[PDB]
C-alpha cells in the first residue's frame, strides 16, 4: 500500500488519546490503499454557539488526519511537521458526524502536500482543505 | 472605532459557553478601537499527543476571534459567514496560553478580510492566519433560504 | 451541462486578446461537460530567471481559467470577481506547455469555489490551486 | 539588517531580466533594512480583458518579490524554492503601477514565510499575500 508503516485503527486512536484530538471526539475511522479517514461529531463540543459545525474545528480535524496520514507514509527515523493549511467552508452542518478523508497530492523527500475533503453523513462536501507538511530527518 | 454592535467580554464569553469555543478553553480576553483578542490554554484540550499546541486547534482559535470580530463590525440585521481561512505554523508552543489578535485588512460591503496573529506568553509569533468572510444580509438571506 | 452561457473557444480567446492572458501566451484549449482547460507555454515569457516555469505565473494561469469557468457557469447578466486564491508548487517544469484544468468544488448563489490543477505535457501534476469567487449582478 | 548577500537594485533587475518578471514589466524598485519592493504597471500586459489589474498577475508579482527577498536573506551558496502562496484581492486597480513590499514573517533554517502587501499609487491596499519558501543549497 501507500503506507510505509504498519498500523491498526485501534493503535492510532490509542496514539491520539488524551489530546485535542480525543477532546474533539475525533476518531480515526477507516483507511484504504491510499486514503485514511477520521470522523468527528457535530455537537456542542464542535459547534459554534448558533448550532452549526464550527469551521475552525473542521480545519483542526483536517490537519489531524492529514498530518497522521503524512507520518504513516514515512519510515521510522522521519516525521512530519505542519507548515501551513488552508480550507474553504462550503455549507453549514448541524447534526450527525462529518468524515474527513485525507489523500496525497504529492509526497516528496522534503515536502508533502495533502488534500483533505470533509463530508456530512449525507455524503455532501462541507469543507475542502490542503495541508503542507515538512518531512524531517530525526537524525 | 470599528465596532457597530455593542458588546461586553462577559456577555460574549457567556454567548460562547457550551460550544466549541468554551470546549477549547478559549476566552475573549481584550479589545481596542480596532482589534480584539482571545486567549487559549495549551493543555490536554488543545495539545497534540506529543505535548505541543495542536496546529489545527490554533486555526480554530483564529477563526473564532476573526469571525467574532467581523460580526461586531456590522449593524443589526447583518452577520458574517466564514468562507475560507489559511495559516502558517511558525513554531511549537508547549506551555501557558496563546493570545490571538484579530485586526481588519479590509471591511467591504460584501466581503471582509481579517488578519489573525497568534503569540505565545513570551510574545513570540507562533501562527499567522487570514480569514475571508461573506457579509450576509439576514433579511435577504431569509427571503432566499427561509 | 454545467455551463449556462453560450460560448466557443474561438470567442473566448478573442475575449482574452490584448490582456495579461494573451501576453502570457495562454490559450483556452478545451472543455468538457464540467471542466475547462487553458494551456500556457514554458518560455522566456513565463519562466523564472533560472530556466523553470515561474510559480507566480502558474497561479496567473490558474486564476485565469478558474475565473473564466466561473463566469461561464452563470446566467447572462452575471459574472464573477476573484476573492482569493492559493496554490502549492509541486515540481519544476522546464519545457513544453502546461495545461490547467478547472473543475467546480461548489457553485453557490453568492460564492463559487474552484479547483485548478496544472499538469505538464507528460501529464505530471506541477501545481494545485483553489480559487474563491464572488458572483455579481452587473446591474 | 536582514540581507546576507550584497547587491544593488541594478544587479537585481539584471538578475530578473529576460524572464517572466521583465516580461510583466516588473522592476525591483527599492529596499530598506528589512523590506524590499517591486513595482508593476497596470496595462494590457497585466490587466484582465475588462480593464482592471489581473489578480493572478498580482500573485505573480507577489511571488517574485517575496522569493527574491528570501534568497537575499541567505548566505552565498543558498537559495529558495517557492512551496506555496495565497492571496486575497481587495479592490480593483485600473491605472498606473502597483507596488509590492515584501517583509519577513519568520526566517528559519529550512523554511521561510513572507508577507507581501501590494498597494496602488494612491497607497490603497489592493492585495495581501503570504508565501512559504523552502531553503536549499
Swiss-Prot record, chain D:
Its EC number is 3.1.2.-. SUPFAM superfamilies: Thioesterase/thiol ester dehydrase-isomerase (SSF54637). Coiled coil: none annotated. CDD domains: PaaI_thioesterase (cd03443). GO terms for molecular function: 1,4-dihydroxy-2-naphthoyl-CoA thioesterase activity. GO terms for cellular component: cytosol. InterPro entries: HotDog_dom_sf, PAAI_dom, Thioestr_dom. Keywords: Hydrolase. It is an enzyme of class 3 (hydrolase). NCBIfam families: unchar_dom_1 (TIGR00369). Belongs to the thioesterase PaaI family. This is Putative esterase HI_1161. It comes from Haemophilus influenzae (strain ATCC 51907 / DSM 11121 / KW20 / Rd). The lineage of its organism: Bacteria, Pseudomonadati, Pseudomonadota, Gammaproteobacteria, Pasteurellales.
Amino acid at each position: 500500500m501507500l503506507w510505509k508503516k504498519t498500523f491498526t485503527l485501534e493503535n492510532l486512536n490509542q496514539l491520539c488519546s488524551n489530546s485535542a484530538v480525543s477532546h474533539l471526539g475525533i476518531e480515526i475511522s477507516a483507511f484504504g490503499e491510499d486514503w485514511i479517514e477520521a470522523t468527528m461529531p457535530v455537537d456542542h463540543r464542535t459547534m459554534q454557539p448558533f448550532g452549526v459545525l464550527h469551521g475552525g474545528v473542521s480545519v483542526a480535524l483536517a490537519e489531524t488526519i492529514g498530518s497522521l496520514a503524512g507520518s504513516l507514509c514515512l519510515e521510522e527515523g522521519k516525521t512530519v511537521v505542519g507548515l501551513d493549511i488552508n480550507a474553504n467552508h462550503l455549507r453549514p452542518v448541524r447534526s450527525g458526524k462529518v468524515t474527513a478523508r485525507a489523500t496525497p497530492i504529492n509526497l516528496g523527500r522534503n515536502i508533502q502536500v495533502w488534500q483533505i475533503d470533509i463530508r456530512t453523513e449525507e455524503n455532501k462536501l462541507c469543507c475542502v482543505s490542503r495541508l503542507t507538511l515538512s518531512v524531517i530527518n530525526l537524525l
